Coordinates of C-alpha atoms and ligand atoms in Angstrom, one line a residue:
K6 CA 73.8 227.7 57.8
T7 CA 74.2 228.5 54.1
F8 CA 75.6 230.8 51.5
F9 CA 72.4 232.7 50.4
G10 CA 70.4 229.5 50.9
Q11 CA 73.0 227.4 49.0
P12 CA 75.5 224.8 50.1
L13 CA 78.6 226.3 51.8
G14 CA 80.8 225.1 49.0
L15 CA 79.3 227.7 46.7
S16 CA 81.2 230.4 48.7
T17 CA 84.4 228.8 47.5
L18 CA 83.6 228.7 43.8
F19 CA 82.0 232.1 44.1
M20 CA 85.2 233.7 45.3
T21 CA 87.3 231.5 42.9
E22 CA 85.5 232.9 39.8
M23 CA 85.3 236.4 41.2
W24 CA 89.1 236.6 41.5
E25 CA 89.7 234.9 38.2
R26 CA 87.4 237.3 36.4
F27 CA 89.1 240.1 38.3
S28 CA 92.5 239.0 36.9
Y29 CA 91.0 238.5 33.4
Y30 CA 89.1 241.8 33.0
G31 CA 91.7 243.8 34.9
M32 CA 94.0 242.7 32.2
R33 CA 91.6 243.4 29.4
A34 CA 91.0 246.9 30.8
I35 CA 94.5 248.1 30.1
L36 CA 96.1 245.6 27.6
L37 CA 95.1 247.7 24.6
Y38 CA 96.4 250.9 26.1
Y39 CA 99.5 249.0 27.0
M40 CA 100.0 248.0 23.4
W41 CA 99.5 251.6 22.3
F42 CA 102.3 252.5 24.8
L43 CA 104.7 249.9 23.5
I44 CA 104.0 251.2 20.0
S45 CA 104.6 254.8 21.1
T46 CA 108.1 253.9 22.4
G47 CA 109.0 252.0 19.3
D48 CA 109.2 248.7 21.2
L49 CA 106.2 247.2 19.4
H50 CA 106.2 247.4 15.6
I51 CA 102.5 247.3 14.7
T52 CA 99.7 249.8 14.1
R53 CA 96.9 250.6 16.5
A54 CA 94.5 248.9 14.0
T55 CA 96.5 245.7 14.4
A56 CA 96.6 246.0 18.2
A57 CA 92.9 246.4 18.2
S58 CA 92.7 243.3 16.0
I59 CA 94.9 241.4 18.5
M60 CA 92.5 242.1 21.4
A61 CA 89.6 240.7 19.4
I62 CA 91.3 237.5 18.3
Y63 CA 92.7 237.1 21.8
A64 CA 89.2 237.0 23.1
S65 CA 88.2 234.7 20.3
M66 CA 90.8 232.1 21.3
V67 CA 89.9 232.2 25.0
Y68 CA 86.3 231.4 24.2
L69 CA 87.4 228.7 21.7
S70 CA 89.7 227.2 24.4
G71 CA 86.7 227.1 26.7
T72 CA 84.8 224.6 24.5
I73 CA 87.6 222.1 25.0
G74 CA 88.5 222.4 28.7
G75 CA 85.4 220.4 29.8
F76 CA 86.4 217.4 27.7
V77 CA 90.0 217.4 29.0
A78 CA 88.7 217.5 32.6
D79 CA 85.9 215.0 32.1
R80 CA 88.0 212.5 30.2
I81 CA 91.6 213.0 31.3
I82 CA 92.6 215.1 34.3
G83 CA 89.5 215.8 36.4
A84 CA 87.5 219.0 37.0
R85 CA 89.3 220.0 40.3
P86 CA 92.8 219.8 38.9
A87 CA 91.7 221.5 35.7
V88 CA 90.5 224.5 37.6
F89 CA 93.6 224.6 39.8
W90 CA 96.2 224.2 37.0
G91 CA 94.2 226.5 34.8
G92 CA 94.4 229.1 37.6
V93 CA 98.2 228.5 37.7
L94 CA 98.7 229.1 34.0
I95 CA 96.5 232.2 34.2
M96 CA 98.6 233.5 37.1
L97 CA 101.8 232.9 35.2
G98 CA 100.3 234.7 32.2
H99 CA 99.9 237.9 34.3
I100 CA 103.3 237.4 35.9
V101 CA 105.0 237.3 32.4
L102 CA 103.5 240.8 31.8
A103 CA 104.7 242.1 35.2
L104 CA 108.3 241.2 34.4
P105 CA 110.8 243.8 33.1
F106 CA 110.0 243.0 29.4
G107 CA 108.1 244.7 26.6
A108 CA 106.6 243.3 23.4
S109 CA 108.6 240.1 23.6
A110 CA 106.4 238.9 26.5
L111 CA 103.0 239.4 24.8
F112 CA 102.8 236.1 23.0
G113 CA 103.8 234.0 26.0
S114 CA 101.3 235.8 28.2
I115 CA 98.5 235.4 25.6
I116 CA 99.1 231.6 25.2
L117 CA 99.2 230.9 29.0
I118 CA 95.9 232.7 29.6
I119 CA 94.2 231.1 26.6
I120 CA 95.1 227.6 27.9
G121 CA 94.6 228.4 31.6
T122 CA 91.2 230.0 31.1
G123 CA 90.4 227.0 28.9
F124 CA 91.0 224.7 31.8
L125 CA 89.4 226.8 34.5
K126 CA 86.4 228.6 32.9
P127 CA 84.2 225.6 31.8
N128 CA 85.1 223.5 34.8
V129 CA 84.3 225.9 37.6
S130 CA 80.7 226.1 36.4
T131 CA 80.7 222.2 36.3
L132 CA 81.8 222.1 39.9
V133 CA 78.9 224.4 40.8
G134 CA 76.4 221.8 39.6
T135 CA 78.4 219.3 41.6
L136 CA 77.1 220.9 44.8
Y137 CA 73.5 219.9 44.0
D138 CA 71.7 216.6 43.6
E139 CA 69.7 215.9 40.5
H140 CA 66.7 216.8 42.7
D141 CA 67.7 220.2 44.0
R142 CA 65.3 223.1 43.2
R143 CA 68.1 225.5 44.4
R144 CA 70.1 225.0 41.3
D145 CA 68.9 228.1 39.3
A146 CA 69.4 230.3 42.3
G147 CA 72.9 229.0 43.0
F148 CA 74.0 229.6 39.4
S149 CA 72.5 233.1 39.6
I150 CA 74.5 233.8 42.7
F151 CA 77.6 232.4 41.0
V152 CA 77.1 234.6 38.0
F153 CA 76.8 237.6 40.4
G154 CA 80.3 236.8 41.6
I155 CA 81.5 236.7 38.1
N156 CA 80.1 240.1 37.4
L157 CA 81.5 241.4 40.6
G158 CA 85.1 240.6 39.7
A159 CA 84.6 242.0 36.2
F160 CA 83.3 245.2 37.9
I161 CA 85.9 246.1 40.5
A162 CA 88.9 245.0 38.4
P163 CA 89.2 247.9 35.9
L164 CA 88.6 250.3 38.8
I165 CA 91.4 248.8 40.9
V166 CA 93.8 247.8 38.1
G167 CA 93.1 251.0 36.1
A168 CA 93.9 253.1 39.2
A169 CA 97.1 251.1 39.8
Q170 CA 98.3 251.5 36.3
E171 CA 97.8 255.3 36.7
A172 CA 99.7 255.4 40.0
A173 CA 102.4 252.8 39.6
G174 CA 102.5 251.9 35.9
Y175 CA 101.7 249.0 33.7
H176 CA 103.9 246.3 35.2
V177 CA 102.5 246.9 38.7
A178 CA 99.0 246.9 37.4
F179 CA 99.6 243.5 35.6
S180 CA 101.0 242.2 38.9
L181 CA 97.8 243.1 40.7
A182 CA 96.0 240.9 38.1
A183 CA 98.4 238.0 39.0
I184 CA 97.8 238.5 42.7
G185 CA 94.1 238.5 42.1
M186 CA 94.3 235.1 40.5
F187 CA 96.6 233.9 43.2
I188 CA 94.1 234.9 45.9
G189 CA 91.6 232.9 43.8
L190 CA 93.9 229.9 44.0
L191 CA 94.4 230.1 47.8
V192 CA 90.7 230.3 48.5
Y193 CA 90.0 227.6 45.9
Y194 CA 92.7 225.1 47.1
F195 CA 92.0 225.3 50.8
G196 CA 88.3 225.9 50.6
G197 CA 87.9 223.1 48.1
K198 CA 89.4 220.4 50.3
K199 CA 86.7 221.2 52.9
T200 CA 83.7 221.3 50.6
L201 CA 84.3 219.7 47.3
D202 CA 83.6 216.0 46.4
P203 CA 86.9 214.0 46.1
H204 CA 85.2 212.3 43.2
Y205 CA 86.1 215.3 41.0
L206 CA 89.8 215.0 41.7
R207 CA 89.7 212.5 38.9
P208 CA 87.9 212.4 35.5
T209 CA 84.3 211.1 35.7
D210 CA 84.4 209.6 32.2
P211 CA 88.0 208.5 31.8
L212 CA 89.2 207.2 28.4
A213 CA 88.7 203.5 27.9
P214 CA 91.8 201.6 26.7
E215 CA 90.6 201.5 23.1
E216 CA 89.9 205.3 23.0
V217 CA 93.4 206.4 23.7
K218 CA 94.9 205.8 20.3
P219 CA 92.3 207.3 18.0
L220 CA 92.1 210.4 20.2
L221 CA 95.9 210.7 20.0
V222 CA 95.6 210.3 16.2
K223 CA 92.8 212.9 15.9
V224 CA 94.7 215.5 17.9
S225 CA 97.9 214.7 16.0
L226 CA 96.3 215.2 12.5
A227 CA 94.9 218.6 13.6
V228 CA 98.3 219.9 14.8
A229 CA 100.2 218.6 11.7
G230 CA 97.7 220.1 9.4
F231 CA 97.7 223.4 11.2
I232 CA 101.5 223.4 11.3
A233 CA 101.5 222.5 7.5
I234 CA 99.3 225.5 6.7
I235 CA 101.7 227.8 8.6
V236 CA 104.6 226.4 6.7
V237 CA 102.9 227.1 3.3
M238 CA 102.0 230.6 4.4
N239 CA 105.6 231.4 5.1
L240 CA 106.7 229.9 1.8
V241 CA 104.3 232.0 -0.2
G242 CA 105.0 235.2 1.8
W243 CA 101.8 235.4 3.9
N244 CA 103.7 235.7 7.1
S245 CA 102.8 239.0 8.7
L246 CA 100.9 239.3 12.0
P247 CA 97.7 240.4 10.1
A248 CA 98.1 237.1 8.2
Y249 CA 98.3 234.9 11.2
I250 CA 95.3 236.8 12.6
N251 CA 93.4 236.1 9.4
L252 CA 94.3 232.4 9.7
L253 CA 92.9 232.2 13.2
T254 CA 89.8 234.1 12.0
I255 CA 89.2 231.6 9.3
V256 CA 89.7 228.7 11.8
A257 CA 87.3 230.2 14.3
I258 CA 84.6 230.6 11.7
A259 CA 85.3 227.3 9.8
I260 CA 84.5 225.2 12.9
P261 CA 80.8 226.2 13.1
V262 CA 80.6 226.3 9.3
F263 CA 81.7 222.7 9.2
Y264 CA 79.6 221.2 12.0
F265 CA 76.5 222.7 10.4
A266 CA 77.4 221.5 6.9
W267 CA 78.2 218.2 8.6
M268 CA 75.0 217.9 10.6
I269 CA 72.8 219.3 7.8
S270 CA 74.0 216.5 5.5
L280 CA 66.1 219.5 9.8
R281 CA 65.2 222.1 12.5
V282 CA 68.9 222.7 12.6
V283 CA 68.2 224.9 9.6
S284 CA 66.0 227.1 11.8
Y285 CA 68.9 227.5 14.2
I286 CA 71.1 229.2 11.6
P287 CA 69.5 232.7 11.8
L288 CA 69.6 232.4 15.6
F289 CA 73.3 231.5 15.5
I290 CA 74.0 234.4 13.0
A291 CA 72.2 236.8 15.4
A292 CA 74.2 235.5 18.3
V293 CA 77.5 236.0 16.5
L294 CA 76.6 239.5 15.6
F295 CA 75.4 240.4 19.1
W296 CA 78.6 239.1 20.6
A297 CA 80.6 241.0 17.9
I298 CA 79.1 244.3 19.0
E299 CA 79.2 243.6 22.8
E300 CA 82.9 242.5 22.5
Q301 CA 83.8 245.7 20.8
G302 CA 83.3 247.5 24.1
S303 CA 86.8 246.6 25.2
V304 CA 88.3 247.5 21.8
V305 CA 86.4 250.2 19.8
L306 CA 84.6 251.7 22.7
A307 CA 87.9 251.6 24.7
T308 CA 89.5 253.5 21.9
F309 CA 86.6 256.0 21.8
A310 CA 86.9 256.5 25.5
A311 CA 90.6 257.3 25.3
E312 CA 90.4 259.6 22.3
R313 CA 87.0 261.1 22.2
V314 CA 85.9 261.6 25.8
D315 CA 86.5 264.3 28.4
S316 CA 88.1 261.8 30.8
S317 CA 90.8 264.0 32.2
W318 CA 89.9 263.4 35.9
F319 CA 89.7 259.6 36.0
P320 CA 91.4 256.5 34.4
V321 CA 89.7 255.8 31.1
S322 CA 90.0 252.1 31.7
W323 CA 87.1 252.5 34.2
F324 CA 84.6 252.6 31.4
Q325 CA 85.1 248.8 31.2
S326 CA 83.2 248.6 34.5
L327 CA 79.9 249.7 33.0
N328 CA 79.3 246.4 31.2
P329 CA 79.2 244.2 34.3
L330 CA 77.6 247.1 36.3
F331 CA 74.6 247.2 34.0
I332 CA 74.4 243.4 34.0
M333 CA 74.1 243.5 37.8
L334 CA 71.5 246.4 37.7
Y335 CA 69.3 244.8 35.0
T336 CA 69.5 241.3 36.5
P337 CA 67.0 241.5 39.4
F338 CA 64.6 243.3 37.1
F339 CA 64.6 240.6 34.4
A340 CA 64.5 238.1 37.2
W341 CA 61.1 239.7 38.1
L342 CA 60.0 240.4 34.5
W343 CA 60.2 236.7 33.4
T344 CA 58.2 235.7 36.5
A345 CA 55.4 238.1 35.6
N349 CA 52.3 236.2 27.1
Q350 CA 56.1 236.0 27.6
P351 CA 57.7 236.5 24.1
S352 CA 59.2 233.6 22.2
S353 CA 62.9 232.8 22.0
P354 CA 63.7 233.9 18.5
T355 CA 61.9 237.2 19.3
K356 CA 64.3 237.7 22.2
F357 CA 67.3 237.2 19.8
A358 CA 65.8 239.7 17.3
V359 CA 65.0 242.4 19.8
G360 CA 68.3 241.5 21.5
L361 CA 70.3 242.3 18.3
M362 CA 68.2 245.5 17.7
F363 CA 69.4 246.9 21.0
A364 CA 73.0 246.1 20.1
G365 CA 72.4 248.0 16.9
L366 CA 70.9 251.0 18.7
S367 CA 74.0 251.1 21.0
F368 CA 76.2 251.7 17.9
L369 CA 73.7 254.0 16.2
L370 CA 73.7 256.1 19.4
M371 CA 77.5 256.5 19.2
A372 CA 77.3 257.8 15.6
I373 CA 75.4 260.9 17.0
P374 CA 78.1 262.9 18.8
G375 CA 80.4 262.7 15.8
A376 CA 77.7 263.7 13.4
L377 CA 76.5 266.6 15.7
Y378 CA 79.8 267.9 17.1
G379 CA 82.5 266.6 14.7
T380 CA 85.2 264.1 15.5
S381 CA 88.2 266.4 16.4
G382 CA 86.8 267.3 19.9
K383 CA 85.9 265.5 23.1
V384 CA 82.3 264.5 24.2
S385 CA 80.5 263.6 27.4
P386 CA 81.2 260.2 29.0
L387 CA 77.4 259.8 29.1
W388 CA 77.4 258.8 25.4
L389 CA 79.3 255.7 26.4
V390 CA 77.1 255.1 29.4
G391 CA 74.1 255.2 27.2
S392 CA 75.7 252.9 24.7
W393 CA 76.6 250.2 27.3
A394 CA 73.1 250.5 28.8
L395 CA 71.7 249.7 25.3
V396 CA 73.9 246.7 24.5
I397 CA 73.5 245.1 28.0
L398 CA 69.8 245.4 27.6
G399 CA 70.2 243.3 24.5
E400 CA 72.3 240.8 26.5
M401 CA 69.5 240.3 29.1
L402 CA 67.3 239.1 26.1
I403 CA 69.9 236.9 24.4
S404 CA 72.3 235.3 26.8
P405 CA 69.8 233.7 29.3
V406 CA 67.9 232.1 26.4
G407 CA 70.6 231.2 23.8
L408 CA 71.5 227.9 25.5
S409 CA 67.8 227.0 26.0
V410 CA 66.9 227.6 22.3
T411 CA 69.8 225.5 21.0
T412 CA 68.5 222.6 23.0
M423 CA 74.9 222.2 19.1
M424 CA 75.1 223.1 22.8
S425 CA 78.7 223.8 21.8
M426 CA 77.3 226.0 19.0
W427 CA 76.1 228.3 21.6
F428 CA 79.4 228.6 23.4
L429 CA 81.1 229.2 20.0
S430 CA 78.9 232.2 19.0
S431 CA 81.0 234.4 21.3
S432 CA 84.2 233.1 19.7
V433 CA 83.0 233.7 16.1
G434 CA 81.8 237.3 17.0
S435 CA 85.3 238.1 18.3
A436 CA 86.9 236.6 15.2
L437 CA 84.7 238.7 13.0
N438 CA 85.6 241.7 15.2
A439 CA 89.3 240.9 14.5
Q440 CA 88.5 242.0 10.9
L441 CA 86.0 244.7 11.6
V442 CA 87.8 246.8 14.3
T443 CA 90.7 247.5 11.9
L444 CA 88.2 249.7 10.0
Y445 CA 87.6 252.0 13.1
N446 CA 89.5 255.3 13.4
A447 CA 88.8 259.0 13.9
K448 CA 88.1 259.5 10.2
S449 CA 85.7 256.5 9.9
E450 CA 84.0 256.9 13.3
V451 CA 80.5 258.0 12.3
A452 CA 80.4 255.7 9.2
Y453 CA 81.6 252.7 11.3
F454 CA 78.9 253.2 14.0
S455 CA 76.1 254.1 11.6
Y456 CA 76.8 251.3 9.1
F457 CA 77.2 248.4 11.5
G458 CA 74.6 249.9 13.9
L459 CA 71.9 250.0 11.2
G460 CA 73.2 246.7 9.8
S461 CA 72.4 244.9 13.0
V462 CA 69.0 246.6 13.4
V463 CA 67.8 245.5 10.0
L464 CA 68.8 241.9 10.6
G465 CA 66.8 242.0 13.9
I466 CA 63.9 243.2 11.8
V467 CA 64.4 240.3 9.4
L468 CA 64.5 237.9 12.3
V469 CA 61.1 239.1 13.6
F470 CA 59.7 238.2 10.1
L471 CA 61.4 234.8 10.3
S472 CA 60.3 234.4 13.9
Ligands
78M1 C1 68.6 252.0 29.3 C2 68.3 252.9 28.2 C3 69.2 254.1 28.1 C4 69.5 254.7 26.7 C5 70.6 255.6 26.6 C6 70.3 257.0 25.9 C7 70.3 258.2 26.8 C8 71.5 259.0 26.8 C9 72.2 259.1 25.6 C10 73.5 260.0 25.6 C11 73.4 261.3 26.3 C12 74.0 262.5 25.6 C13 75.0 263.3 26.4 C14 74.5 264.3 27.4 C15 75.4 265.5 27.8 O1 75.5 265.9 28.9 O2 76.1 266.1 26.7 C16 77.0 267.1 27.0 C17 78.1 267.4 26.0 O3 79.3 267.5 26.7 C18 78.2 266.4 25.0 O4 79.3 266.3 24.2
78M2 C1 103.4 232.3 44.2 C2 103.4 233.5 43.3 C3 102.2 234.5 43.5 C4 102.5 235.9 43.4 C5 102.2 236.7 42.2 C6 103.3 237.4 41.5 C7 103.5 238.9 41.8 C8 104.3 239.3 43.0 C9 105.0 240.5 43.0 C10 104.8 241.5 41.8 C11 105.9 242.6 41.7 C12 105.5 243.7 40.8 C13 106.6 244.2 39.8 C14 107.4 245.4 40.1 C15 107.9 246.1 38.9 O1 108.3 245.5 37.9 O2 108.0 247.5 38.9 C16 107.8 248.2 37.7 C17 108.6 249.5 37.5 O3 108.6 249.8 36.1 C18 108.1 250.6 38.2 O4 107.6 251.7 37.5
78M3 C1 87.7 221.8 10.4 C2 87.7 223.3 10.4 C3 89.0 224.0 10.0 C4 89.4 224.0 8.6 C5 90.1 225.2 8.1 C6 90.0 225.5 6.7 C7 91.1 226.3 6.0 C8 92.3 226.6 6.9 C9 93.3 227.5 6.5 C10 93.2 228.2 5.1 C11 93.4 229.7 5.1 C12 94.6 230.3 4.4 C13 95.3 231.4 5.1 C14 95.0 232.8 4.8 C15 96.0 233.9 5.1 O1 96.8 233.7 6.0 O2 96.1 235.0 4.3 C16 96.9 236.1 4.7 C17 97.2 237.1 3.8 O3 96.1 237.5 3.1 C18 97.7 238.4 4.5 O4 99.0 238.7 4.2
78M4 C1 61.1 254.0 9.6 C2 59.9 253.3 10.1 C3 60.1 251.9 10.6 C4 59.0 251.2 11.3 C5 59.0 249.7 11.4 C6 57.8 248.9 11.7 C7 57.6 247.5 11.1 C8 58.3 246.4 11.8 C9 58.0 245.1 11.5 C10 56.9 244.8 10.5 C11 56.3 243.4 10.6 C12 55.7 242.9 11.9 C13 56.4 241.7 12.5 C14 55.6 240.9 13.5 C15 55.8 239.4 13.5 O1 56.1 238.8 14.6 O2 55.6 238.6 12.4 C16 54.6 238.9 11.5 C17 55.1 239.5 10.2 O3 55.7 238.5 9.5 C18 53.9 240.0 9.4 O4 54.1 240.0 8.0
78N5 C1 108.4 223.4 45.8 C2 107.9 224.3 44.8 C3 106.7 223.9 44.0 C4 105.4 223.9 44.7 C5 104.2 224.3 43.9 C6 103.5 223.2 43.1 C7 102.1 222.9 43.4 C8 101.8 222.3 44.8 C9 100.8 221.4 45.0 C10 100.0 220.9 43.8 C11 98.6 220.6 44.1 C12 97.7 220.1 43.0 C13 96.3 220.5 43.0 C14 95.3 219.7 42.2 C15 93.8 219.9 42.6 O1 93.0 219.1 42.2 O2 93.5 220.9 43.5 C16 92.2 221.1 43.9 C17 91.8 221.2 45.3 O3 92.0 219.9 45.9 C18 90.4 221.6 45.5 O4 89.5 221.2 44.5
78N6 C1 96.0 217.8 29.8 C2 97.1 217.0 29.3 C3 97.2 216.8 27.8 C4 96.4 215.7 27.2 C5 96.2 215.8 25.7 C6 96.7 214.6 24.9 C7 95.7 214.0 24.0 C8 96.1 212.7 23.3 C9 95.9 211.4 23.9 C10 95.2 211.4 25.3 C11 96.2 211.2 26.5 C12 95.6 210.7 27.8 C13 96.5 209.9 28.7 C14 95.9 209.1 29.8 C15 94.9 208.0 29.3 O1 93.8 208.4 29.0 O2 95.2 206.7 29.3 C16 94.7 205.8 30.2 C17 93.2 205.4 30.1 O3 92.5 206.2 31.0 C18 93.0 204.0 30.4 O4 93.3 203.1 29.4
78N7 C1 62.6 254.8 32.3 C2 63.6 254.8 31.2 C3 64.2 256.0 30.8 C4 65.2 256.0 29.6 C5 64.6 256.1 28.3 C6 65.6 255.8 27.1 C7 65.9 257.0 26.2 C8 65.7 256.7 24.7 C9 66.2 257.6 23.7 C10 66.8 258.9 24.1 C11 67.2 259.8 23.0 C12 68.3 259.3 22.1 C13 69.7 259.8 22.3 C14 70.1 261.2 21.7 C15 70.7 262.2 22.7 O1 71.4 261.8 23.6 O2 70.5 263.5 22.4 C16 70.9 264.4 23.4 C17 71.6 265.7 23.0 O3 72.1 265.6 21.8 C18 72.7 266.0 24.0 O4 73.5 267.1 23.7
78N8 C1 63.5 257.5 19.2 C2 64.3 258.8 18.8 C3 65.5 259.1 19.6 C4 66.2 260.4 19.3 C5 67.2 260.3 18.1 C6 66.7 260.8 16.8 C7 67.8 261.0 15.7 C8 69.2 261.0 16.2 C9 70.2 261.4 15.4 C10 69.9 262.0 14.0 C11 71.0 262.8 13.4 C12 71.8 263.7 14.4 C13 72.8 264.7 13.7 C14 72.4 265.3 12.4 C15 73.5 265.7 11.5 O1 74.7 265.4 11.8 O2 73.3 266.4 10.4 C16 74.2 266.4 9.3 C17 74.8 267.7 8.9 O3 74.4 267.9 7.6 C18 76.3 267.7 9.0 O4 77.0 268.5 8.1
78N9 C1 67.2 254.6 22.2 C2 67.6 255.4 21.0 C3 68.9 255.0 20.2 C4 69.6 256.0 19.4 C5 69.5 255.8 17.9 C6 69.1 257.0 17.1 C7 70.1 257.6 16.2 C8 70.5 256.7 14.9 C9 71.5 257.2 14.1 C10 72.2 258.5 14.4 C11 73.3 258.9 13.4 C12 73.0 258.8 12.0 C13 74.2 259.0 11.0 C14 74.8 260.4 11.0 C15 75.7 260.7 9.8 O1 76.4 259.9 9.3 O2 75.7 262.0 9.4 C16 76.9 262.5 8.7 C17 77.9 263.2 9.5 O3 77.7 264.5 9.5 C18 79.3 262.9 8.9 O4 80.0 261.8 9.3

């Protein structure tokens, strides 16, 4: 008796991640529209450009937090508690938004989820490997099944949450996200005790006595320096929300900039164009929940259904393409930098495609939802070529997990350029921009 030929414990982690991704992407599907709403009532004193920038940097921090959660679990708290307490903080983040508050709750919600996802996201995948011996040939299948559960949650969430927001408002919809995470915790907690190794209740590589102090010092210097920067910023008058957002953008981009300059000082050099292509691809893919969400709400005949449902197309196409590419890579298979190149080209085509309706019809009307369907089909096609390979090429493993954070940080700057007047230029310029760089990468391949 198995779960698709895998140890029964996979069923627990499958559901755990399905519900967490439900909570996360359910929130993402309506958070931007929610900020627009708070703005329209005068409760939130920012522009839509800033709100769009917030969504991008929010994403950026979540991915950044993810590069740290594995360490904290491996060295300090253990993978099993990390997942649990991460789940708790994620649940509380969605509760904060469900409470009878407005803009005052946004920061607290954002922080809780950044930290919680940081503890949960890397460590659930770790525990999946825990199910198998070193020997097990079933590993690749088990992770594929796990990924399917991730995509499932991401798929149903905007449908269910978006419908709920339409029927019962934002606060109820945010509560559904919280309940989703809660369900994830129930199944995880009770299902875990039956199936998970008690070894992972504790860290597997705990700090040795002599490691405690320098780690505390290292963490301390970072906080003091970051706090110092913020003090100076407020002294010299750089203290607006766009300013803090720029600071985090700089931070998110500096980290890979430093580790490279650190490590360089020589095939690492060859990894640079790969890393650049990854950042750019993630930038475009992550604009689906920001720029494309804006386009869906302003430029699409979506009178008969919640416009947040467009967020379901991303994981839908992942699920549709997946068994195909599963087959395709079994049946000369192109190289890895070739995949990145063609992978970035498809991202570029997805934005080039979106420039068409504005150029043909104008930007003051509404167009068919099919334009967005086509756009997402194109970008996810690019994801099938880049994501399954990116970790393999880089084998700096962290560099791979950071490419998504840098793309989002870059987006935090770029998405402020998008509006009805700049629609066609935005899509053409960046669409073509990414296509040419994918052409360059073929030359450098
Ligand atoms: C996996 C590869 C797929 C590539 C996607 C490209 C195919 C479709 C592109 C967009 C279709 C155009 C819209 C069709 C339509 O019914 O237009 C009606 C009109 O209301 C438009 O405003
Ligand atoms: C152990 C805790 C787990 C449970 C998760 C927390 C969620 C439980 C109940 C959520 C109640 C929804 C909020 C109701 C509400 O504010 O109504 C909004 C009002 O504006 C109606 O339009
Ligand atoms: C080890 C990697 C991290 C190192 C970070 C390097 C530099 C950190 C901070 C410096 C950036 C200055 C802040 C910029 C800023 O807030 O400008 C805002 C202003 O233009 C808007 O009103
Ligand atoms: C408007 C028309 C655009 C047509 C574009 C066609 C050309 C695209 C790429 C040209 C070079 C081939 C790349 C093949 C390759 O893998 O490397 C070899 C290349 O470096 C040859 O010099
Ligand atoms: C009286 C109100 C407060 C009660 C709620 C607080 C939380 C209750 C129990 C905490 C349990 C800690 C879980 C840590 C953990 O590793 O869980 C993992 C599971 O064992 C499965 O892996
Ligand atoms: C998730 C909780 C927050 C931890 C971050 C604080 C980082 C700074 C110093 C590390 C604190 C670790 C405390 C426990 C510890 O490692 O000491 C005992 C050693 O295992 C044995 O000497
Ligand atoms: C077996 C695969 C089938 C799909 C093939 C992919 C199609 C590739 C390019 C299609 C054409 C480019 C989009 C332009 C477009 O939508 O024009 C349509 C009219 O403008 C609609 O009013
Ligand atoms: C592989 C080919 C797939 C099919 C797409 C081919 C080209 C797609 C779009 C080209 C431009 C579409 C609109 C043209 C346009 O807006 O003309 C500009 C007018 O002068 C506006 O005043
Ligand atoms: C699978 C095919 C993918 C589709 C890509 C083909 C189309 C590429 C670019 C189309 C749009 C080009 C720019 C149009 C443009 O800016 O014209 C000016 C407008 O009239 C004013 O904004």
